[PDB]
Ligand binder design. Structure first.
Ligand SMILES: Nc1ncnc2c1ncn2[C@@H]1O[C@H](COP(=O)(O)O)[C@@H](O)[C@H]1O
Ligand SMILES: [Cl-]
Ligand SMILES: [Cl-]
Lengths: 150, 151
């Protein structure tokens, strides 16, 4: 449980360390106090143990599980391919695509913690409670996850 | 009345090989029957995942972290990927058949598990069960065998 939180952080760090330098797009949302049941209902059920390796395999481009969001519930990957509400806010830079607007939209509609890897640039970003943090370093991503989840 | 576990299993396997065979994506999938596969499951990466054709496909995409080794199904879950199975020590195995096939055949000597393979060389779908090896099944043949065995 404390060790489960450290495995969660390590899984996310391994996945983003693989995907970011390969510019593999990724979108991962973690449930907090507000249920994500309605978005989980839109995805393919996995109910899978969390590991960096499984997160990488999910997001490999042009594969059946890659398109849409992974939603983490507790210590399980609940689903992949979930459809998240887009943000209609105009303050979103033009260069930020669908994945980023999906993450931002969920962070305006829930207290879920979402991170993105850009398929255009490999930039790592976080969307949480209406704040959007662009282009984190891997070390910064890790310490932010640790502070939030450990 | 929703689709039974057995119907979902058959559909998952059929969808997966239907995708991997034409693409010549190698695959190795073993299903536990009455004899526990616990010692082989211990060698794999824990997934404990719901069975879907989509997940099986994503596991075996070439040059990915989960694609090497065997997937082992236990009950209605994908227990592990990347598992090690016993390689067949037999010498009456054609030189056409590589290590995935020898692993499938080996496990079918050591247990009553049902294993199927997709060849990365030809895309051929094959089954290894109770020491017998059935090469190059059609998709229809594969499905009917799965139904006769699992339903
Ligand atoms: N003992 C084994 N059990 C399960 N899979 C294996 C085993 N040995 C090799 N493989 C896999 O068989 C495939 C072909 O092996 P190779 O011909 O050595 O490239 C690769 O995915 C290997 O990881
Ligand atoms: Cl980003
Ligand atoms: Cl930073």
């Amino acid at each position: 449980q404390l060790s489960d939180d450290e495995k969660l952080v390590a899984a996310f760090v391994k996945a983003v360390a693989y995907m970011s330098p390969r510019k593999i797009g990724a979108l991962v949302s973690i449930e907090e106090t507000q249920t994500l049941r309605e978005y989980i209902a839109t995805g393919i059920p996995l109910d899978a143990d969390i590991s960096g390796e499984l997160l990488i395999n999910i997001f490999i481009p042009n594969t059946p599980l890659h398109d849409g969001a992974v939603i983490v519930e507790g210590n399980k990957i609940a689903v992949s391919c979930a459809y998240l509400p887009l943000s209609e806010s105009s303050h979103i830079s033009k260069e930020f695509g669908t994945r980023h607007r999906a993450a931002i939209g969920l962070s305006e509609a829930s207290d879920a913690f979402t991170f993105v890897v850009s398929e255009e640039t490999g930039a790592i970003s976080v969307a949480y409670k209406g704040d959007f943090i662009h282009d984190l370093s891997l070390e910064a991503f890790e310490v932010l996850l640790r502070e939030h989840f450990i």
